[PDB]
Paper text:
M. pneumoniae binds to host target cells by means of a polar structure known as the attachment organelle, and glides in the direction of this differentiated structure at a speed of ~1 µm/s. The structural results reveal that P1 (1627 residues) and P40/P90 (1218 residues) present a similar overall organization and topology in the extracellular regions.
The refined P40/P90N structure, at 2.65 Å resolution, has agreement R and Rfree factors of 21.4 and 23.4, respectively. The sequence of P40/P90N presents two long insertions with respect to P110 of more than 60 residues each (Gly297–Thr368 and Leu395–Thr462 that are referred as S1 and S2, respectively). Both insertions, completely disordered in the crystal structures determined, are found between β-propeller blades II and III. Besides insertions S1 and S2, the structure of P40/P90 presents only three short disordered loops (residues Ser118–Gly127, Ser168–Gly175, and Ala774–Arg777) and the N-terminal domain from P40/P90 can be seen as a well-defined globular structure with two long floppy pendants.
Numbering used by the authors: 23 to 117, 128 to 167, 176 to 294, 373 to 398, 462 to 773, 779 to 998
Amino acid sequence: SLANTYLLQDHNTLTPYTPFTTPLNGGLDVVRAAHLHPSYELVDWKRVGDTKLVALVRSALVRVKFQDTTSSDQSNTNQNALSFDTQESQKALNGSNSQDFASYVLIFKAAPRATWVFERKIKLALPYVKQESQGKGSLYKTLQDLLVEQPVTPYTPNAGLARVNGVAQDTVHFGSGQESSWNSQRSQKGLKNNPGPKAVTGFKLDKGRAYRKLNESWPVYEPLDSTKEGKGKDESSWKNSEKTTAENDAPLVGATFSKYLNTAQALHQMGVIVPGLEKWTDALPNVITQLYHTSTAQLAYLNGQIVVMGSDRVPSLWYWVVGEDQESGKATWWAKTELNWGTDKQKQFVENQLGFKDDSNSDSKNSNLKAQGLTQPAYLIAGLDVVADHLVFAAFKAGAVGYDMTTDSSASTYNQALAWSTTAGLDSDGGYKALVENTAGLNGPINGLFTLLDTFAYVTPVSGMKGGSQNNEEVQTTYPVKSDQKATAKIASLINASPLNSYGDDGVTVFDALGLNFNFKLNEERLPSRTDQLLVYGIVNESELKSARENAQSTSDDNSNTKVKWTNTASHYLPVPYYYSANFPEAGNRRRGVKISTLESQATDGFANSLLNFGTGLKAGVDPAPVARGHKPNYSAVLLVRGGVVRLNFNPDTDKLLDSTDKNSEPISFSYTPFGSAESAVDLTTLKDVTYIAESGLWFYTFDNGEKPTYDGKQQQVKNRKGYAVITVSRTGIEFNEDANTTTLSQAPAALAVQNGIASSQDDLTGILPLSDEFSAVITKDQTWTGKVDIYKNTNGLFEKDDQLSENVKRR
């Protein structure tokens, strides 16, 4: 209809466009209309029905503090350790009312002449964590020792991710010089039939990319090679000397860049508060402040409830479930949200690598998440959407491992993180379930280089119940802590700003990230990792969401260790395409080794690395095609990852994940289809919009080149920050209840991503208007007052410019 309007964003303004391609009015300035400070920036917004508009706003002036010490042994005992630093926020203002500059969810009501009236704002309060005095699991204790990696920027090179390998597990349990007694004593050490004495226990934290505490700050600088430069977790060495070294080597615009990169503009673009680079040398604000600012990134509205989640480029430790009626709402911790990983074994894999837990240990400095009875703490959120009165989400599991707190300089695992490869053994039984439930690396390391005669492999040739001479015994695995040190061990928690648990500069980590581990069977099957490059997805109902709100609103008391249970979720191993790397290795050759530092990236999808996977643009959609009599209409959610499109399938009759009877069959709820060279050329970090067209059942992914950082790591102006590209996602394969007898599905219904024909490298995009099923308008800026309008003909998701109408709509 002509009376219909399309809402388009321009920074803080949402302008209504008519099907004549012209704006109806000056648009709604979300920040000005909500009576908010100029520092507020519109992050996300959703039109709800026809009379509602929900917006998400954040300010670069927000300051967060974590109270670590926990003085006396009484006090208020019910005060949150997490609070907004009003004094620092006022300090930052200096470069008229006192405010914390907290993020808000804004509610607007429709008004005549296609206008919006401000209704109310809901404050996104910090999650709750009780300040102790006690120095029953403690999240407070974990947060005191928690280390978070500096965010991975699009300019982070492969060698920058590479960390020197940790100590072998034979050295850990037998000590230097006594490693030779492995075969005879492994049995009495909880390592019966373990064939990997040389399996790496983790990665060195003395050098490389910064790991910082909640109240510490990440540097703007990052090393080119983490095996050679950087100070890792060593904040003192950075502050005292290495800061000035990086400052001289990598200065900001206004100087060889031989050791470090200045990624200031890349961080600002990721939603990291970089003072002096905001719209309206100084160290960046706290890790805790950066985590708050980045966590208020994406929203969804579901029957009076608003859900807010973090960004896809920085890990988030919490999420919001707030009432529309409420004035404010505290966040729910991800560590207190137990998800279904597919199998109980799959949960065990993630949770066992979180840290060390033993009945004999009760040391307060062994503060890791596992010891505190907490679950997976962080996620790299691909997005969230609502469909059939349910919330659908997808995220990559951020790497969360343990680290040794020891002061003993000569200790085996001193100054190192404890992480290992969890790839299923070469001898795993067939089928999806047998592979994911394979015991290889369940409790500790096992994988490494195994030289079978003159053919190598980076995975164990024996696992599960295929050990011993008779191949019937258990191949045991145990945590990398020496038996005598179990009672006195001090393992804390560490969060990686990527889907990787281990950064160990070795072949096994390369094989695990690139999905290069395959069994030596004619029916060749890819061996899955149960900790690296893990995509987490699911459907969540109102009662599951209500539990998350209730868990957030609980103040210390007796529900401090109570967990939220989302059972209709799953996890899937989703590595980066190996072909994104120029020199990808292959197991089974003739010796001819490729580690992280020697891996060469040939990726053109907006990342200097070819190691870490990334997920963006989750959008749900109800299939327009008719289904069989007595069955609900099908719905799926799609998202873009490095190398292809992933489709998530659900059962509409139960509002659960799409499942089948057979366990040998791959899950029909998950599908990954690799996209072509043309779509691999698209910068996935520049996604500006995702739209689903109900009538056609097609998703449209809009990419804006203006979303790129202004300067690269070597402080050079970024090439092609002009233009746009559009990808169309369509359904493929047999659908659920497609016909009368379609009961169970053998194959997972897939998606297909293609560059549709709407592309340019010379103009700034205002937006795209779906004028009809057959036509679409592409609004552009250059200096154009009315905005340059291009008309395209829609041929089932494929587009071709109409020169006749494009000129006609242009010419004055």
